[PDB]
Symmetry: C3
Subunit: 255 residues, 3 copies
């Protein structure tokens, strides 16, 4: 069974918005640990890995695992109705036919109750990869979102070059080229707006800006984006949720 | 004749915006007691009833009744030009072919004079009454429109329940007095087209409270009282 | 060659945005005087004249004149990515193939470097009105809703803008005044002759986009000659539009 109550709907609204476009449908796997999603986009290039840990809820009971196959388009029309501050409770029975979402307004006598019918993904999507990487970059999600959009105007490729001194993003098309170069630095007031680099080996990889443009919509889930790169390995783009959990994207470079 | 001065253009601006979508043209009926509008949508399903009483004006002279057939989109382009705090005067002569709108800026040396040509247009007891904030009702109408073309409304002594079902899921919004006020003789169970309700809730600009009155197989009333002294009312038939 | 550094990118951003609609491509002529642009619309009705004087730069060297033919849409994609507060440096070498724009973010170790390839590209007045550019922008937009031409009538005591269409007419009348708290919010009229000219609101709608560059618009009118719409940039320089009446 599933009974998960959020203090605030903001988190689940931001999650559904961040993935709904590159992912049309997916399985929400619920267990005592929390709720997870493993999915791939339609072109089978971009891997999405989500974890909403038990700790992100105020009340969470899932005494028996349940899988919920959910159309994210339909679920977004439901969840978008909620105020960020609303209580939000997800309910599903054992062997469920549907998911229920109940919204409760904080300082109002208003309760909204929604029910979405489930789909059978009828192919559990499995995924596991704790990995070793050549280089790891931590930088503000907002700056990385902005350079992706800005450099998409010039071409469909983003070259990424990491050394101990700097990270360099470049994009060249027929109009002209653009490079954005960041060096490690500390923001003393708010360490989350710092840039850090730790590497074994220098890295030089190219990614399709179409997919990076989808990834960076998750910038609403965390101030910080962790980028992990390896020489012939899918790069990790990680958004850690402060309440506990994460949203991750895996994207192969171009070869 | 007609000479009506408003202290502020806000009221007319809100009025024209609230109805211009549901009603593209309509007659303004000026009288010794104020300005009236009775209009029906193209579908002949929605009745719009407007009263701007003479008390809404700082100065109002209408020695003899006059009808002003106005294309609301054209009028909307003129009246949108005004600041909310502008003086606004409406002028029309006997047997008029146009309406005149004079805007005077409070804090500047700016006077604007507009003229729009007229067109010729051709002219109680309820089971339950709900009061709720217009903003809340506007929000649930929009939110549930995403699920269905129909909004079911079910009123009892202890609750009001709005439901909307479709292929992307069902949704129900439940308001309790225990936020909302409810007065009922009979319980009520009516269904309305959300396309029309979506137009009605635009009048939330005129009033923080919406009064909804329903009856078994009667047009429901959606009332927005202007605290200047008029009202904007929408009458909408249920289905079946 | 060109090396001009701005303390803030805001100026160039607003300049590029103000003209990129009326003008698709243009030459940036750089000299020790500064950077200027002279271009005319596709309709051959509107002449755009820009001057970014060297006084608007914190550092400016141009030891030799250079002409930079630039696609403004491409260039806007670049310049709009900058924050207003960013350091902005324009570079070009002698006999250039491209223009370079370097953005430095304040308070960060973040430097963006862009380069776009170049292309080859080729009075006495009766009355002067000064008024807030906001107020002129607003009346243009409001009266564009009723017709495609704006009549302008200037006397010692008033300025009158009218616009008549098949729906209806509308007129806006302004009187001179001095604003004692902020002189820039004044309306001033000084004329030899009264003036009565009509202009296309299609073009005026493009002109008023320059209201981002200055609080004040100066309008200079003469019978049967092009009217001047001037936006003086306080940092030093101007953006001018010349528009023939009908």
């Amino acid at each position: 069974m599933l009974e998960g109550k959020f203090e605030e709907a903001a988190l689940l609204k931001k999650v559904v918005e961040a993935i709904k476009d590159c992912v049309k449908k997916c399985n929400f796997n619920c267990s005592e640990h929390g709720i997870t999603v493993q999915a791939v986009d339609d072109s089978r290039v971009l891997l999405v890995s989500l974890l909403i840990g038990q700790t992100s809820f105020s009340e969470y009971r899932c005494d028996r695992d349940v899988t919920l196959g959910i159309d994210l388009e339909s679920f977004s029309k439901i969840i978008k109705s909620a105020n960020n501050e609303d209580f939000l409770t997800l309910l599903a029975e054992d062997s469920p036919d549907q998911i229920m979402a109940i919204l409760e307004e904080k300082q109002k006598e208003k309760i909204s109750e929604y029910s979405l019918k489930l789909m059978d993904i009828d192919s559990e999507f499995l995924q596991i990869d704790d990995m070793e990487y050549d280089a790891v970059v931590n930088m503000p999600s907002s700056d990385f979102a902005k350079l992706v959009r800005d450099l998409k105007n010039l071409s469909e490729s983003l070259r990424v070059v990491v050394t101990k001194d700097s990270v360099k993003f470049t994009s060249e098309g027929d109009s002209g080229s653009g490079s954005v170069i960041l060096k490690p630095y500390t923001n003393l007031k708010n360490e989350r707006e710092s840039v850090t680099i730790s590497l074994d080996d220098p890295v030089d990889l190219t990614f399709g800006l179409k997919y990076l443009n989808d990834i960076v919509k998750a910038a609403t889930l965390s101030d910080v984006i962790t980028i992990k790169l390896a020489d012939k390995t899918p790069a990790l783009f990680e958004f850690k949720m402060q309440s506990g959990g994460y949203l991750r994207f895996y994207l192969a470079p171009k070869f």
